[PDB]
Design a protein around this ligand. Sequence first.
Ligand SMILES: COC1=C(OC)C(=O)C(C/C=C(\C)CC/C=C(\C)CC/C=C(\C)CC/C=C(\C)CC/C=C(/C)CC/C=C(\C)CC/C=C(\C)CC/C=C(\C)CC/C=C(\C)CCC=C(C)C)=C(C)C1=O
Ligand SMILES: CCCCCCCCCCCCCCCCCC(=O)OC[C@H](COP(=O)([O-])OCC[N+](C)(C)C)OC(=O)CCCCCCCCCCCCCCCCC
Ligand SMILES: CCCCCCCCCCCCCCCCCC(=O)OC[C@H](COP(=O)(O)OCCN)OC(=O)CCCCCCCCCCCCCCCCC
Ligand SMILES: CCCCCCCCCCCCCCCCCC(=O)OC[C@H](COP(=O)(O)OCCN)OC(=O)CCCCCCCCCCCCCCCCC
Ligand SMILES: CCCCCCCCCC(=O)OC[C@H](COP(=O)(O)OCCC(C)C)OC(=O)CCCCCCC
Ligand code: SF4
Ligand code: SF4
Lengths: 174, 70, 186, 117, 66, 315, 102
Amino acid sequence: MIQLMLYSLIITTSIIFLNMIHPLALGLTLLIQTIFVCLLTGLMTKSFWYSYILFLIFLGGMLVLFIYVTSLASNEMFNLSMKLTLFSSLILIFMLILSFIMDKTSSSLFLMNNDMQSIINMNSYFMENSLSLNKLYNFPTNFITILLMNYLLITLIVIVKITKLFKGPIRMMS
Amino acid sequence: MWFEILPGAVIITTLLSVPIYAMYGLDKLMIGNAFRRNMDERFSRVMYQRDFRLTDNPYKMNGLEQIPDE
Amino acid sequence: EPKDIVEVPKGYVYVNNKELSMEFADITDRAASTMFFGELLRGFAVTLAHIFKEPATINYPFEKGPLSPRFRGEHALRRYPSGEERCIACKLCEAICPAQAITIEAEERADGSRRTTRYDIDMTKCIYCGFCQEACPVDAIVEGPNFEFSTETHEELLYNKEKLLCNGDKWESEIASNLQADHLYR
Amino acid sequence: MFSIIFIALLILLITTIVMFLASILSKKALIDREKSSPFECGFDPKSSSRLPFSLRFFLITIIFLIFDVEIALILPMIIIMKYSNIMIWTITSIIFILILLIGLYHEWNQGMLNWSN
Amino acid sequence: SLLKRAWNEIPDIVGGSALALAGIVMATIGVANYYAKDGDNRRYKLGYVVYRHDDPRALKVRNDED
Amino acid sequence: MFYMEFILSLIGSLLLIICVLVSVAFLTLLERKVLGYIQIRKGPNKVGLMGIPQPFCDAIKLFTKEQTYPLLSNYLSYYISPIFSLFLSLFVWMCMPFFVKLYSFNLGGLFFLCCTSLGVYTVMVAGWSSNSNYALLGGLRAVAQTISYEVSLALILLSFIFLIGSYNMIYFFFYQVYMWFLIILFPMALVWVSISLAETNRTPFDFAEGESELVSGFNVEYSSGGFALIFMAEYASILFMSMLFCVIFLGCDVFNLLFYMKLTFISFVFIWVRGTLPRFRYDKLMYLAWKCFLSFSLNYLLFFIGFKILLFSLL
Amino acid sequence: IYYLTAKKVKRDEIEMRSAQNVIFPILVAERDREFLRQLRRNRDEEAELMKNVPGWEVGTWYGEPVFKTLPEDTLVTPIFKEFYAHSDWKSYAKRAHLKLWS
Ligand SMILES: COC1=C(OC)C(=O)C(C/C=C(\C)CC/C=C(\C)CC/C=C(\C)CC/C=C(\C)CC/C=C(/C)CC/C=C(\C)CC/C=C(\C)CC/C=C(\C)CC/C=C(\C)CCC=C(C)C)=C(C)C1=O
Ligand SMILES: CCCCCCCCCCCCCCCCCC(=O)OC[C@H](COP(=O)([O-])OCC[N+](C)(C)C)OC(=O)CCCCCCCCCCCCCCCCC
Ligand SMILES: CCCCCCCCCCCCCCCCCC(=O)OC[C@H](COP(=O)(O)OCCN)OC(=O)CCCCCCCCCCCCCCCCC
Ligand SMILES: CCCCCCCCCCCCCCCCCC(=O)OC[C@H](COP(=O)(O)OCCN)OC(=O)CCCCCCCCCCCCCCCCC
Ligand SMILES: CCCCCCCCCC(=O)OC[C@H](COP(=O)(O)OCCC(C)C)OC(=O)CCCCCCC
Ligand code: SF4
Ligand code: SF4
């Protein structure tokens, strides 16, 4: 029931996100979108780690983007429309009705949770995020992690090169 | 002089001690066990499923009186 | 001891003039005070010591602060011990009132004595300076000890002759004690 | 997590009831023309706050974003120590923190952690 | 020369570098102590493992005292 | 899951919310009393019996004064942000380690970091939507502050987690049965005290609400309920990081009254730093949390990586 | 002192893991007996329900076998949805939503 509610909320916020001209409307819409996407991703995995990781990522990213909102397109008009509110309300109540009259066994995800796994699975009895995150630090794929460290260092070098700090601060009509 | 700081501090000490100790009563009123079952590990959750399968109360314990005489 | 950048003259004190020591002991001392917050812990220790002090607060209005017999407060018009009002309408106080708060109008009284018929003080134009106290030859106008005379209305802070006479009648004992204990200073 | 959703909705509901009770029990006086105006320390503003704002720490913000996704790869290895090869885990962990120290000290050497000015 | 300037201006960096060098030495000591003995064959094993007598993993099983 | 659980989880969460709110009120009373006693003067003494119902005087007045309807603001975004600020500042308190099963937070550090990042989002939304220059400056100062302390707060937390081996804060109790972690982590007792004041926007890092650099910071257009929920959100954040100082550095036991005495003492320390040290500049804050705190966190993380490999071979 | 404390915590964790390892075989024996009983019940119920569909055969997708290159008498473990294909949402939320509710 909660998964179908998250489906309906993600659909309604995606309709809202496709229709917003103002960057702050897009920012708040993608705030509630990443909240609902973080909860939905959690439902699929045995543990709740990557939802938390994705939330730290997408709250570390738009924290910067608001500073660029206040530095570029700080002055732009909001335009509320009754058509979008009526459309979102009608679609939202229609999908809550459709989710209430639906069989929730057929609409549930086939991905296995921590309790959907059987009792005979001895790997399920370990600590909940151990075997999932193991291959980041194991022998076949530590070199991809090495490549990611060097990639992030090269990324930082690129950011320093193409954002020249000695040219001055950035604003509109600089 | 300086002891008047202690009114206004003990209230922070007492009231924040409220939501733990009250549950140490409020479980014992209805659960019967002061500690409700922790669900951190998968095995504790599976054995909680076993207890709630055996009895409607998972905190009611089946002792040796359940076992038939043979 | 740290050295001096500029040699001081006689009778002068130079602040921020000591060179920072480059020997290992002073560098380790300032490094330990840097990473372990030595001056921050000293300031916290001084502050925690002054938590344990006695407060200097006084329980107003049960406890009132110290004052002086020379204190300048509400203007008041004294009277003689015989009962006659002391003021003789000479207009020295209004001539010396530097914000021109006092307004005096006078005529001959029915017994022939020189008396006022209007003695107004704009208490919102007063600065409580005691020039009328020093200018008065018969010691009529004084600054009474009263300072709890805050009003709700601007018109009540424009004293008439009758309000000043009522202040002189009400505050007579403390004004008499202050002019007993203060008159040879003036 | 389903209980956390319900208690988060209950906290949001309780805070909205608290704010609406603060609005209902507030004193209802008539709105003056210059009461609603922005404060601006008692005078006229001369400029709206929607005027563009100068950013002197753009490089620090993008370095913060890069370092935060670097934080997102450190958090696994608390769990991974007890279940992996110790040699490979130490090579990855000490090489990760030393590469971060090379990057941070190199940008400290260039002075790119100082605000543009 | 440069150590006195770094110890005067940025002493927390010097203390952190000493702590990190001590950590690198202790990591080397811990890895060498782990691989000096049979560290891959741990005494207590996660899960329920049963070995037959003809298995090559059977004679590697430790018989220490708790 | 048993039905009674849900009921007792709801009851314990609501009781925790009510007790944290009244403890926020008495924390304002405690700050106004000892912060006076930091100086020579006294605290509130006249109203009520001995100043005890003084937060009730402060709460009756702020719930009855006129709501500001500002002119140039976006009112529909200005009205909602203190509600969300109080909502996350009370929602973070569900992470509290109960010895009973309140909530089985296996990932309590990540939950704490998420609500920590979201509280400053409410602060910077309330700063922008007031449409005042001082409010926008306080909001941008709050964004620069959280960009300064966020990665430093995370890496320092990881070092404590390494001493635990798990992300569940009740496992802080088993590793502190013989002694407190104040012996080991005294430099990050200082560093976590520095970060926790930057988390709660408190002196020496008070740039989001400045009384001398700005005029009340981002609270310049908030009055009579919006300011009240912003103020309780800030003080509940102060109570939460006082609790987290007591969890990590001190004993994580909750069945002793000494834990709540220690929490009142760490709250007194939070008042005590404000009454002694002057405020920084946020230039020096950004130069501090990027060149000193982050470098020390990475270095002592290396020290804990080596010490945990040394300890694991000995076991 | 932290090394001694970690020794004590490791001793408690090893004792708890030993209790788990000694309790588990009874639980998995009960699991496999109830699993075989429920598999027999599901095979009977699928044969009862699909008697009207002409192309349906028991255990195959319209005559096509699900799993090939296997022995004829093997048993692969069915998925979680086929195990609860004859039950309401209350059983699916009773089993699958254990961690997410508490
Ligand atoms: C030389 O040149 C100069 C001049 O020229 C001469 C000048 O003139 C000036 C100008 C200066 C002046 C005019 C005077 C000088 C100024 C000063 C001295 C100011 C400095 C002093 C301070 C700032 C004070 C010290 C600081 C303190 C004490 C910190 C605390 C201060 C506060 C304001 C906090 C109080 C606010 C509160 C308490 C908010 C209220 C909210 C609540 C109480 C909410 C809590 C709620 C509850 C407890 C209960 C709620 C429960 C609920 C909802 C649930 C319950 C439910 C149930 C069912 C029970 C200057 C600067 C100058 O330089
Ligand atoms: C009962 C408790 C009572 C006390 C309670 C209060 C606790 C103490 C105060 C807590 C915080 C108070 C509020 C925040 C104050 C912030 C002050 C601050 O940081 O100022 C910036 C100042 C800046 O330094 P500065 O003042 O010297 O500035 C000049 C230098 N530049 C400009 C280059 C920076 O201080 C620091 O940053 C100091 C370092 C802080 C972090 C500690 C690092 C320790 C490193 C490891 C040491 C290793 C030793 C050797 C080991 C060898 C092993 C082999
Ligand atoms: C195991 C393999 C390891 C490989 C390397 C791994 C990564 C590095 C690990 C630490 C090694 C030492 C790093 C020293 C450089 C730190 C960064 C630095 O000093 O940057 C230059 C800085 C620029 O100044 P700026 O930050 O702009 O502002 C003024 C100061 N706040 O300018 C200053 O701060 C001026 C002060 C002098 C700067 C140069 C000092 C170099 C000294 C090196 C030796 C001493 C340090 C170690 C001593 C203890 C060792 C146990
Ligand atoms: C994570 C991000 C999430 C983002 C999405 C969040 C969405 C949340 C839901 C949004 C709903 C929006 C509904 C808006 C309705 C009001 C619109 C509005 O703007 O109203 C204006 C009104 C007065 O403002 P105005 O005069 O326009 O002044 C501005 C001039 N510059 O403003 C007002 O009067 C202020 C509002 C007052 C509301 C009072 C409601 C009536 C009382 C309700 C019951 C209260 C009961 C309390 C006691 C309960 C006891 C059990
Ligand atoms: C209005 C919402 C504000 C944002 C909340 C963000 C929460 C942290 C991010 C996240 O995904 O956390 C995953 C966590 C996962 O749970 P945990 O892994 O923390 O705990 C297990 C859970 C009963 C064992 C402890 O979920 C939440 O925090 C629930 C959020 C509810 C939101 C309600 C409104 C849609
Ligand atoms: S005290 Fe000074 S200002 Fe006041 S009435 Fe006397 S002369 Fe005038
Ligand atoms: S100086 Fe004295 S006597 Fe002369 S007019 Fe004034 S009050 Fe009267």
